[PDB]
Amino acid sequence: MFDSLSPQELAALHARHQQDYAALQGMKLALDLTRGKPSAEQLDLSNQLLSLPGDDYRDPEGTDTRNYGGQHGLPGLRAIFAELLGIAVPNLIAGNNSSLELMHDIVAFSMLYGGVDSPRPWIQEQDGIKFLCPVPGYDRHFAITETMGIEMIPIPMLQDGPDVDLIEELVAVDPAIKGMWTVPVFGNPSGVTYSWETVRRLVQMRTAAPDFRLFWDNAYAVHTLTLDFPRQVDVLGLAAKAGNPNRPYVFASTSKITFAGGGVSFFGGSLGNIAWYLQYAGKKSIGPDKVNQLRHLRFFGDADGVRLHMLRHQQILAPKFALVAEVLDQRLSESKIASWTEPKGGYFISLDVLPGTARRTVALAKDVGIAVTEAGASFPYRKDPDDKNIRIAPSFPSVPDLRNAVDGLATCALLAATETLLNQGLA
Amino acid sequence: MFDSLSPQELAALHARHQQDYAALQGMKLALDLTRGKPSAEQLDLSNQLLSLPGDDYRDPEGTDTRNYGGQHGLPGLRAIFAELLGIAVPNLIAGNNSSLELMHDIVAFSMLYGGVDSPRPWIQEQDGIKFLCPVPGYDRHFAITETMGIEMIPIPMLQDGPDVDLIEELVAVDPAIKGMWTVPVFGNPSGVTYSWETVRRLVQMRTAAPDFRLFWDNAYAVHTLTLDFPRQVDVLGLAAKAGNPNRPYVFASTSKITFAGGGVSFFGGSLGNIAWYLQYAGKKSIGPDKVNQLRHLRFFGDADGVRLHMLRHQQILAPKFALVAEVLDQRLSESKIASWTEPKGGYFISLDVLPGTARRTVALAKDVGIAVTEAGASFPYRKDPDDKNIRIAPSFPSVPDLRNAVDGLATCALLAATETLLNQGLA
Ligand SMILES: Cc1ncc(COP(=O)(O)O)c(C=O)c1O
Ligand SMILES: Cc1ncc(COP(=O)(O)O)c(C=O)c1O
Ligand SMILES: [Cl-]
Ligand SMILES: [Cl-]
Predict the structure, then answer these.
(1) Number of Cβ pairs closer than 8 Å across A and B?
(2) CATH of B2-56+303-427, one of 3.40.50.300, 3.90.1150.10, 3.40.50.720, 3.30.43.10
């Protein structure tokens, strides 16, 4: 940490940081690093969708997609994602424009009705319900459990998955633990992909709750930043082999493949779980939007069509991620106050600044017109116990804007560090 | 009832009915009068949607509809339905492809969280919850309350609304009554449209539950079978004037305007109710499909565009409804065993055959290859206490198929009547 600088040298460095920050403030910036959404250039890749499906409104089975019926979604589109996810067509359904809505409804159904093999609806559990939450994690997962009054237990992330030793120890003895949130490939925002061994342990471990569920939110399933695709671990297959076929609920989406908010969602599970979901989903809706599923089927053609499309996204995104890392390295590496992820896929870089300074860094950035994700955002209840983590979303801005924004962020992180050491430390 | 026929004459008539039925059976029919969905010819009216929105993916406000954001739906599309429904844009949101899903989620939110001004979540009411259900009514409404364990109280339908005297008497003294299902224009399947006076009474009546709600499912809001449109009663305005602004929840849909399952839904309410819904809907989804809302906005143009489109539907549908009535009249009127609605809009005709024979009539039809809606389908718990009601859906089949199907249905209804009088009555 500022290795071998004396207090006098640190005070001189702090003055340089203040001057960098004054200059930054003079530029009157209006930049934003918070939006985990595709750029306009990425969305342009899918503009053919805007004139699809055209005159032929029938799918390959002859179904008139313009009329009512069919809860499972179009088999032809499901076959594409069955190949990508390694889940058979009967074990996969296609929904409307939101995978979050599938996860949410599953939690709501679990509360009101219980899961397919629950002893009772979760709302009838007088001692409450808990979910395990690997951190840093996805704030919209946490929002679902928080709103339903489900207690969240944060779990440390390690190199090839969460802390599975700890998870096993907790779930074995606490029947209130009903679920775990995961993003098992390129996690938001850790960038961590769960190893085969991690997945095997999670589907085999003994749980005090007979109806424990892994919410396997494979949001980034094909979302590589390199020219290679990750191998999908067969979580449903491994779970069935362990005698826990109902344990995993698998989700996926085309929001960051085609149009964000105009895509198609997917839910995968055991046949029993598919039937359970559809029994209650059938009370909610006659069924999903088949015309939008058809447009996607026509656009993609097959699984290789999706893969090639992802490589086109990769060509736009990879330079943005490379840029963020390069700027952070060049500005922060020598000070040793920070560390950051170097993800091989997904939509985020996770930055840790000097512990005790993340909130301050965000406030400094806000005052020079750079929006940076709120401190604590990737934690349940927004509680980052070390006040160090900042999520960075590189996807949306132009390269020149991203460069300025991250360089500004670095200036703020450095100033927050020297300010705190000198003014609080050497008070 | 078979006026002035002697027992010998009735037995001879019964023999003629058996011969008509034998002949019907010989035709080896495969017909269906159960599907409340638009015909292919109606759906063809909206085929321009299949190539929309085209290159311009921006709405009039400049919003890129292909990207995330915006929970309320596109203001331009909401402005069209604001005019049609008589509800201001800020009081109306546009969703995805299902109005049922809006109603369902509202009931689920009410259970888990309570409504905006509830004393507690409805799930915490130890003595249970009840909804009033005007009958005959919409089976998918009843499916929502049944699945949530909400007791249903059936209420007789009268000429210009339900039995409001009875509703007022019950809601005043039972704090467990939290809601009422309605279809207030061209009801499914009564065809009844609630008068202004009926609506005024429903929004003014005292309720023991301070958070009582009218589920105002205006599914058939513009769905005329004549060249005239019904006047929309201002239920939200009247409710606000009575000091019960939060009482009505208004729903509408384009499923029977454009594509059934590929349309846009709407929810309208007080500003407080809109904010309440969106607070919990925001935990479920980042927001609705704006691209599909844009296609609809481009297609319709304005409220008069929707109206003209409905008159194009009316030209297809009205002859089908006229045909059903003519066949029933010609075959059944003299026997006086039956009565049926003559709706001025909506998607159904409600037929009452001889009480005690509806199940038998349906079974007879099934055995000659004519699918007719299950007896009891328009009642909570599928309980028609008079075993008389049969819902007829005229919209889907071709004219020649409809003619054959309804004429067959009449033959079955007549045979069920004579069979029952002779074999059970004169046993
Ligand atoms: C982990 C994760 N799941 C789900 C989603 C949202 O996808 P959808 O648009 O299908 O809700 C996101 C980002 O949108 C995400 O990061
Ligand atoms: C009364 C009523 N409400 C709602 C609906 C369904 O509309 P949506 O497709 O918007 O769920 C129907 C028929 O579909 C209906 O008859
Ligand atoms: Cl997560
Ligand atoms: Cl109803």
Answers:
(1) 155
(2) 3.90.1150.10
